[PDB]
Amino acid sequence: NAEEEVELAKRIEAGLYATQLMTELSERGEKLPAAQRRDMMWICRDGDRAKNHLLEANLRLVVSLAKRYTGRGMAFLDLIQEGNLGLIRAVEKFDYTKGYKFSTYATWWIRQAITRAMADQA
């Protein structure tokens, strides 16, 4: 659902930030108190779970688009592979504040990856 989409994207951003914060804290010799570190660690892992879930919820969309391009020189599983690279590119660039659905946003990135993959093999 569109609503669960936003929740997943927030979890992803929070996780990315939690990860960066701990990385940059390390670069200055400072460590977080054990209680903070534990929560940061949880947020970071929760973010990666959210990323996998958002990906998973959109693999079928990759498949529906790939089916449009079968029978033109590229094997079905190869279309799906390239389509999946388009999907994770969309995930990383997607901005939940704009207002549009992630699936709507991902469509262009998925078609693009497939299209460029087909042109470049030929």
Binding site: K10, R11, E13, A14, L16, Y17, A18, T19, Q20, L21, D39, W42, I43, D46, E92, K93, D95
Partner: protein, 32 residues
């Protein structure tokens, strides 16, 4: 070198916005 996921996030979201988000998440955890 391609931009990482973090690099992309940093282009669209201020660190102050990211702190607010992290806090809102830390909150749901501790509740509870």
């Amino acid at each position: 070198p391609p931009r990482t996921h973090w690099d992309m996030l940093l282009e669209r979201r201020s660190i102050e916005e990211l702190e607010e988000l992290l806090k809102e998440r830390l909150e749901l955890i501790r509740s509870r």
